[PDB]
Amino acid sequence: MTLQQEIIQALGAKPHINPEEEIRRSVDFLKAYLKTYPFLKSLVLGISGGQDSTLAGKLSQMAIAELREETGDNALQFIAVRLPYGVQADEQDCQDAIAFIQPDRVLTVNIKGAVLASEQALREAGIELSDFVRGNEKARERMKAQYSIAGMTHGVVVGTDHAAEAITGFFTKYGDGGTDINPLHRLNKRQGKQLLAALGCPEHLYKKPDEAALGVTYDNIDDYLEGKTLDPAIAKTIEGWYVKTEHKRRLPITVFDDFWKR
Amino acid sequence: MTLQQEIIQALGAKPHINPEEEIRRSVDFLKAYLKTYPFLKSLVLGISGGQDSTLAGKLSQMAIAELREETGDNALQFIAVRLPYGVQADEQDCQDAIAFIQPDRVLTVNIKGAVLASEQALREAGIELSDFVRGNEKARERMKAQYSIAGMTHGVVVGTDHAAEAITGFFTKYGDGGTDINPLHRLNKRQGKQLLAALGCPEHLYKKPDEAALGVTYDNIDDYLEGKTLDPAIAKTIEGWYVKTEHKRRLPITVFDDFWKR
Ligand SMILES: NC(=O)c1ccc[n+]([C@@H]2O[C@H](COP(=O)([O-])OP(=O)(O)OC[C@H]3O[C@@H](n4cnc5c(N)ncnc54)[C@H](O)[C@@H]3O)[C@@H](O)[C@H]2O)c1
Numbered sequence: 001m002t003l004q005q006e007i008i009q010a011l012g013a014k015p016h017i018n019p020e021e022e023i024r025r026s027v028d029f030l031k032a033y034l035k036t037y038p039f040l041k042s043l044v045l046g047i048s049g050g051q052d053s054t055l056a057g058k059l060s061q062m063a064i065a066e067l068r069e070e071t072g073d074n075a076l077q078f079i080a081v082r083l084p085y086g087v088q089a090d091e092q093d094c095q096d097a098i099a100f101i102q103p104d105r106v107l108t109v110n111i112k113g114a115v116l117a118s119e120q121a122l123r124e125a126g127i128e129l130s131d132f133v134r135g136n137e138k139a140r141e142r143m144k145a146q147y148s149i150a151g152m153t154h155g156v157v158v159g160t161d162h163a164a165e166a167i168t169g170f171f172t173k174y175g176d177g178g179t180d181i182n183p184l185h186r187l188n189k190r191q192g193k194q195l196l197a198a199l200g201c202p203e204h205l206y207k208k209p210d211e212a213a214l215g216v217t218y219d220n221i222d223d224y225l226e227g228k229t230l231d232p233a234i235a236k237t238i239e240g241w242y243v244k245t246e247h248k249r250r251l252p253i254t255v256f257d258d259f260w261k262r
Numbered sequence: 263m264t265l266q267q268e269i270i271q272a273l274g275a276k277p278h279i280n281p282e283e284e285i286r287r288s289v290d291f292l293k294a295y296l297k298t299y300p301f302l303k304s305l306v307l308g309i310s311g312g313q314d315s316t317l318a319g320k321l322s323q324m325a326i327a328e329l330r331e332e333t334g335d336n337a338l339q340f341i342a343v344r345l346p347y348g349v350q351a352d353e354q355d356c357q358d359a360i361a362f363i364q365p366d367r368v369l370t371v372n373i374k375g376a377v378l379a380s381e382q383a384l385r386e387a388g389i390e391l392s393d394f395v396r397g398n399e400k401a402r403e404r405m406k407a408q409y410s411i412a413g414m415t416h417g418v419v420v421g422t423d424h425a426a427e428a429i430t431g432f433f434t435k436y437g438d439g440g441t442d443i444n445p446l447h448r449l450n451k452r453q454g455k456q457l458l459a460a461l462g463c464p465e466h467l468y469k470k471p472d473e474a475a476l477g478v479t480y481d482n483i484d485d486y487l488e489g490k491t492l493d494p495a496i497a498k499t500i501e502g503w504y505v506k507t508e509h510k511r512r513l514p515i516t517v518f519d520d521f522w523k524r
């Protein structure tokens with residue numbers, strides 16, 4: 001088995017998908033999970049106006065709306081959470097995503113105060129954070145906010161992770177990686193677009209140096225996930241990120257694990 | 263296979279252990295991991311003066327000290343982090359644990375400002391947190407601080423999780439559960455004490471209504487983990503917590519998972 005085959009199998013990616021089938025698979029997964037744990041009443045999701053959260057938000061609201069009609073349980077709620085860093089105006093993509101999703105509830109939580117407070121406590125301890133590490137700090141504060149909301153609303157936190165994000169480990173460990181249920185896991189980036197098109201999402205919310213990584217485009221990543229043969233330089237770069245970030249796609253390491261050993 | 267057998271097997275717990283052997287197993291695991299990823303230079307751990315962090319701290323410092331002597335790499339460092347909630351004096355158990363461990367570096371980060379800032383942002387969004395949810399918030403802020411320190415020191419975050427904590431899911435999801443490497447995983451509570459005794463730890467740092475859960479003592483939990491037959495009421499309570507918290511011991515849920523299905 002080649003490394004490309006191992007990566008594809010681990011992430012569950014397929015060369016082609018039926019969008020209507022995948023929309024239903026995701027919605028029914030969310031519903032079946034909620035029905036298994038009937039004390040759960042909410043799906044919680046950070047929304048930004050980006051492709052991934054717009055898709056996961058639409059699927060989550062559909063799951064809730066259907067289950068609410070079937071069970072008559074008016075306590076069931078989809079909770080969209082805007083998580084801006086600072087009072088930085090109001091973005092149109094996010095507003096358009098909200099109009100499309102029609103969420104039951106929208107909460108807005110400004111994470112800047114907490115991130116700055118974390119930084120000051122570290123500063124007093126003698127540690128000055130870089131801009132790079134502060135980005136991960138922000139992602140962890142967004143995780144924290146969603147978990148606090150879930151904690152107060154019998155909720156679970158929906159994640160936007162999918163194959164085209166996971167392959168390179170291009171997410172923050174216990175930040176946007178810290179979630180409960182991931183309805184987009186298996187899909188590549190262009191496939192996410194096919195689902196949004198099938199759902200009637202406004203094209204400007206998903207229609208596209210813009211690259212996934214240095215010298216690697218999203219078309220490169222999706223082609224790799226679909227089993228295609230790329231330039232060895234592109235494939236090697238993709239494979240290098242996957243191997244480097246194995247720790248992000250596995251549970252904390254114990255004396256029983258062997259995957260990391262040479 | 264009974265549920266007790268499944269739990270024991272999943273957590274890796276044994277009826278009896280050789281303390282010297284287990285000390286070495288844990289120390290050598292930490293060293294071998296660091297040698298596999300030679301860009302890593304630090305082990306980072308929150309210390310409180312409690313049994314679990316005192317044990318994981320001593321093992322971590324031994325790993326670093328040995329690897330530093332073997333490789334001559336003076337950049338290798340064990341970083342102990344005090345994480346008080348507020349300027350609440352200086353605790354003797356923590357000071358005694360530091361004296362025993364002799365850590366290379368000790369950092370002190372007051373998490374109260376950030377937790378209060380998180381709470382105020384939620385308050386403005388219309389969400390008032392309960393004391394219970396605030397406890398989980400604090401655990402997540404401690405995670406955040408350790409990850410920021412790791413991010414600035416080529417570090418990995420050591421976790422204190424072990425069988426007697428994991429069985430009931432008595433940890434915060436992505437809080438003290440959010441770690442990189444767990445050298446105590448497999449051990450029950452009394453076994454942790456045997457390792458500390460073998461290491462010459464001051465008895466007051468590990469020698470013991472004080473109960474693990476309602477109507478369940480740590481002796482009950484350890485006996486269950488060692489395969490003993492308890493009162494059905496105690497066993498049922500333990501088994502109920504395990505089943506309820508399966509989600510805490512698994513990766514975010516995807517359409518491919520079947521463990522949660524009835
Ligand atoms: N080309 C790109 O666009 C690109 C490239 C790299 C990273 N990313 C971005 O950077 C951010 C993530 O940065 P990150 O990965 O430095 O932060 P992270 O916090 O997600 O992961 C780093 C942390 O993981 C732990 N760790 C590191 N190596 C480990 C190992 N071998 N075993 C166990 N644990 C280990 C350490 O605690 C470390 O602090 C994301 O936003 C990501 O998308 C983007």
Ligand SMILES: NC(=O)c1ccc[n+]([C@@H]2O[C@H](COP(=O)([O-])OP(=O)(O)OC[C@H]3O[C@@H](n4cnc5c(N)ncnc54)[C@H](O)[C@@H]3O)[C@@H](O)[C@H]2O)c1
Nearest residue numbers: 037150151155156157180398432433434435474475476509
């Ligand atoms: N008897 C005791 O001493 C006792 C009893 C219970 C809890 N604990 C303590 O309480 C704290 C943890 O509380 P917690 O467990 O409420 O907080 P947590 O944040 O660790 O876990 C709750 C979160 O997990 C998610 N979740 C809940 N059910 C889920 C499910 N079925 N599937 C997927 N995700 C799900 C939700 O996001 C929820 O907000 C810890 O300090 C723990 O030790 C102690």
